[PDB]
């Protein structure tokens, strides 16, 4: 160390072959040879010195066995180096050819020395600072030496064996071990070992009695929130569940059951739906969904709640394109099977309870039946609507209301739901041979007399609806007849009191005349008269003036003249004086025309009375 001490080892010579042989003949102890050899001043470079093999050979010669030579060498070394430093030097020397054999022998004797002290592999884990490697533990130069000592200890102490994963857990917690492995699999140099250690961790958790519940949080599945199915930790958890089931047959719990432990239906079901939409999780989600459905069926969960949980209440106008609609329909079918009418929950009941009325469902079906990929499901939903109407014995007018056809107005005949109405009408009439209903029954329920008559008259002018409108007008006449309608009441209902002017060209008046003729054709006690209704509605003067006006028009001249003669007869039967008749007549005619009508009236008055 001191100055001029360096410049005297310049002069002081190496012992040499002769000096070694003389020492051996004198049985100089190996520690002494080590001190005189220049190996005191090598430190961690000891094994790299050209004189180290010389000392090793000498010490081997003085001893009897390789073990004795190694023990003497270690005793000389275990008083000059720490356990870590010596182990690191030995590990480095083991990777080199000249020193591999001696380094291995020294490591063997070193491990025996530790074992005789009964330092456990945990103790040597402490000694090597493997506590402190952390995320770099797998790259520690002393990890291999620790593994060698662990194997030796397991061999010599079969009753007290251990593993690397167990020790790492004991000193890092499950959390530190998990994040160490996660970091290690990001470096390709330590990826394979990290995967092996992850498998070891699963086995350790099984050994320590951990359940799938605990390993759920241990894999940090909770940290994935609502997107756990996408995690590789989820696959690890499924593997753990398989292992656990093999270990505990009677406590076998499925994946869905544990998910229910950590999630309730309200959030779990949407997770499965979303995962089902994603191709990568398509299969797993499907299986879970399958199990979930069975579990609802065992619990007898209502199809309405199943509808809500599957998010179908969010579909709105896209309900029939929702991928979960088929699953829900199948679940409802399974739920209702072997149930009776009062105990079953049908698709139409769920639709209505979810605020999707019959008309909305029918419109969605009409749209979806045009698209090939939704046609089958659309037809199933249509069957559900018809079953719902049939089960409660709905009449065709009830179905007309259920489709909201009373709110459609003029175009009700061209609405896509009109086909549904007529389809149900055919079905109902076929199923009720004695109670057949007419196509007009729904319209009559939905629209009043004047509105319906005007609708039919308007539709008659359109070629696409003329045939149907003509048939329906005849049906409406029969409908009024069956309902005992007095013609003079119907006149008021049709709003024909509005104007006597032009009434002889009013199409609504023509419809009323059709009903009047039909009413008189079925033998009333009193044959109903048109002139009576006109007089009651408008009065003598108004009717007579209108008749005078209409007689001047070629299209109404004949009818106007016939009505005028009928009016004169009516006045005669009620004993009207010629003065009153003249007063009425000359509100609508001149002196001479009024005079001749007066004379004709007087002639037939005399014929009747005189």
């Amino acid at each position: 160390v001191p100055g001029f001490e360096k410049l005297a080892n310049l002069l002081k010579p190496k012992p040499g072959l002769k000096k070694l042989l003389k020492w051996a003949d004198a049985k100089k102890p190996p520690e002494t040879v080590f001190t005189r050899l220049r190996l005191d001043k090598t430190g961690t470079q000891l094994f790299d010195n050209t004189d180290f093999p010389v000392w090793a050979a000498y010490t081997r010669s003085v001893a009897q066995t390789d073990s004795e030579a190694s023990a003497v060498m270690l005793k000389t070394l275990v008083s000059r180096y720490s356990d870590e430093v010596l182990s690191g030097m030995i590990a480095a020397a083991k990777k080199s050819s000249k020193t591999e054999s001696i380094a291995t022998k020294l490591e063997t004797e070193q491990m025996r020395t530790w074992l005789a002290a009964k330092k456990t592999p945990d103790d040597m884990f402490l000694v090597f600072k493997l506590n402190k490697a952390g995320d770099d533990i797998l790259s520690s130069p002393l990890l291999s030496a620790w593994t060698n000592y662990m194997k030796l200890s397991n061999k010599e102490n079969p009753k007290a064996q251990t593993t690397l994963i167990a020790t790492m857990t004991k000193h890092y917690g499950d959390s530190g071990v998990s994040q160490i492995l996660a970091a290690a699999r990001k470096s390709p140099a330590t990826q394979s070992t990290a995967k092996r250690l992850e498998a070891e961790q699963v086995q350790l958790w099984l050994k320590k009695g951990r359940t799938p519940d605990d390993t759920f949080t241990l894999l940090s599945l909770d940290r994935a929130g609502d997107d756990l199915l996408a995690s590789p930790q989820f696959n690890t958890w499924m593997k753990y569940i398989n292992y656990y089931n093999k270990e505990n047959p009677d406590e076998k719990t499925t994946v869905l059951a544990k998910l229910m432990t950590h999630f309730d239906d309200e959030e779990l079901t949407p997770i499965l739906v979303v995962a089902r939409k994603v191709p990568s999780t398509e299969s797993t989600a499907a299986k879970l969904q399958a199990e979930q459905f069975k579990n609802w069926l065992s619990a007898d969960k209502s199809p309405e709640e199943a509808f809500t949980l599957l998010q179908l209440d969010k579909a709105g106008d896209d309900l029939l394109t929702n991928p979960q609609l088929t699953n829900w329909l199948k679940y409802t079918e399974n739920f209702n099977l072997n149930k009776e009418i009062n105990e079953q929950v049908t698709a139409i009941q769920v639709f209505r309870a979810q605020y999707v009325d019959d008309s909305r469902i029918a419109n969605m079906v009409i749209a979806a039946e045009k698209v090939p990929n939704t046609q089958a499901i659309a037809k199933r939903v249509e069957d559900e609507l018809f079953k719902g109407w049939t089960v409660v014995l709905n009449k065709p007018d009830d179905v007309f209301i259920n489709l909201k056809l009373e709110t459609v107005g003029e175009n009700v005949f061209e609405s896509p739901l009109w086909s549904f109405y007529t389809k149900f009408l055919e079905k109902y009439n076929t199923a009720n041979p004695g109670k057949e209903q007419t196509m007009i029954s729904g319209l009559a329920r939905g629209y009043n007399d004047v509105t319906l008559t005007n609708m039919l008259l308007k539709a008659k002018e359109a070629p696409s609806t003329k045939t149907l409108a003509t048939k329906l007008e005849d049906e409406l006449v029969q409908y009024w007849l069956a309902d005992k309608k007095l013609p003079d009441k119907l006149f008021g209902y049709l709003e024909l009191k509005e104007s006597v002017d032009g009434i002889l060209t009013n199409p609504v008046f023509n419809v009323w005349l059709k009903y009047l003729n039909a009413f008189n054709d079925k033998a009333p006690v009193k044959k109903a008269l048109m002139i009576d209704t006109l007089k009651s509605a408008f009065g003598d003067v108004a009717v007579s003036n209108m008749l005078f006006a209409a007689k001047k028009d070629p299209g109404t001249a004949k009818v106007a003249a016939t009505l005028q003669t009928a009016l004169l007869s009516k006045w005669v039967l009620e004993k009207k004086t010629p003065g009153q008749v003249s007063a009425i007549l000359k509100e609508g005619a001149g002196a001479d025309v009024s005079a001749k009508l007066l004379a004709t009236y007087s002639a037939k008055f005399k014929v009747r009375w005189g």
Binding site: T147, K151, N154, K155, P158, K159, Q161, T162, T163, L164, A166, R196, A199, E200, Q203, L204, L206, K207, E247, P249
Partner: protein, 380 residues
């Protein structure tokens, strides 16, 4: 003459590492054709090393590799070179996936059983030692299944080392390794010298029967029949019979079912006196077991286990249980009892049969289920 015909083999070799798994599987399936095209020496030197070093495929490919390597001896030059198949299979035996590593163990057993003793000593013993000391649990699990291949031809020092290694595996810190050791214990013990069968194998068995986990203990108890069939009556009574007696009244019905299955077999091994003092009460309890499966297992054997017995002991102990089983609630219990109850007409003798078995015979004749009837009526 050669290049054109073997171009397709080159295509198969190329497809060995194709992106599509189907082509990789097809090339694996045609490994023998590729090897024949290569020649033996170079199947040994190019192909086997390629399979060893490129092993990161899907489990289907690895399983196919294990299957093919299990029957690949002729394509490497025959028995003399069979050992060159060991390394790859060894790697495959460390794969976690059950089917892959189990197939690798089966293939290792095939190749070893075809290997000859000098080659066994030179390579298979070292393979077994490496697997047993492996730092991954799958390696030790696999190691448990290849001890019987290497033990018979090993030198005495290696035999002692192998016994110690199996004892260590029984003691393993990972339960699955201990389960594998229990599973293969009987089969390994079949190859051990009598001297060490009654000391080292007994130590392994007793350690397993006292294991802290249920599954290890159940697997160990399953091996009682094999171990007893391998032992002298003295050691059988001393070591196995108490285990049977203790586990016949374990809280686990599966363990009791195992014991009920093995009782009759152990009866021959132990002899009449131990069977009377030890096996009969255990059998009686199993016949009157809480679980229907155990009762079925015991009832299927009342006849066999009365045939070896003294008719006095049979009448005193077995008949009451037979009566209760006749009026048992389970139709399967009644079926199992009826299928064998007739066999006791000669064993008991006319005098005893008349007092004891007559009523049960007629009752079983008038059973509510055609199973029991048919079982008793067919064997008349």
């Amino acid at each position: 003459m050669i290049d054109e015909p073997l171009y397709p083999i080159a295509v198969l070799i190329d497809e060995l590492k194709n992106d599509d798994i189907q082509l990789r599987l097809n090339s694996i399936r045609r490994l023998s054709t590729i090897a024949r095209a290569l020649g033996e020496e170079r199947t040994r030197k190019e192909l086997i090393p390629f399979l060893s070093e490129n092993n990161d495929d899907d489990d289907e490919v690895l399983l196919a590799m294990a299957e093919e390597l299990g029957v690949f001896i002729p394509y490497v030059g025959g028995v003399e070179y069979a050992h060159v198949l060991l390394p790859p299979l060894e790697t495959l035996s460390t794969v976690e996936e059950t089917c892959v590593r189990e197939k690798a163990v089966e293939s290792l057993c095939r190749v070893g059983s075809q290997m000859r003793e000098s080659d066994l000593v030179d390579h298979f013993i070292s393979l077994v030692k490496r697997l047993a000391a492996g730092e991954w649990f799958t390696a030790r699990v696999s190691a448990c299944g290849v001890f019987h291949i290497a033990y018979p031809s090993a030198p005495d020092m290696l035999k002692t080392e192998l016994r110690s290694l199996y004892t260590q595996l029984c003691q393993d810190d990972m339960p699955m390794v201990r389960r594998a050791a229990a599973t293969n214990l009987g089969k390994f013990a079949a190859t051990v010298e009598s001297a060490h069968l009654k000391t080292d194998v007994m130590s392994m068995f007793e350690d397993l029967t006292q294991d802290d986990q249920d599954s290890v203990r159940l697997l160990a108890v399953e091996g009682c029949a094999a171990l007893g069939k391998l032992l002298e009556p003295q050691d059988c009574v001393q070591h196995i019979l108490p285990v049977i007696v203790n586990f016949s009244q374990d809280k686990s019905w599966r363990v009791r079912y195992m014991v009920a299955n093995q009782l009759y077999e152990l009866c021959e091994a132990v002899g009449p006196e131990p069977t009377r003092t030890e096996l009969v009460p255990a059998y009686v309890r199993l016949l009157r077991d809480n679980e229907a499966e155990v009762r079925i297992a015991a009832a299927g054997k009342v006849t066999k286990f009365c045939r070896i017995l003294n008719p006095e002991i049979a009448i005193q102990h077995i008949l009451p249980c037979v009566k209760e089983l006749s009026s048992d609630s389970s139709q399967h219990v009644r079926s199992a009892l009826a299928s064998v109850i007739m066999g006791m007409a000669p064993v008991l003798g006319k005098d005893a049969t008349i007092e004891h078995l007559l009523p049960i015979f007629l009752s079983l004749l008038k059973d509510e289920f055609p199973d029991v009837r048919l079982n008793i009526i067919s064997k008349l």
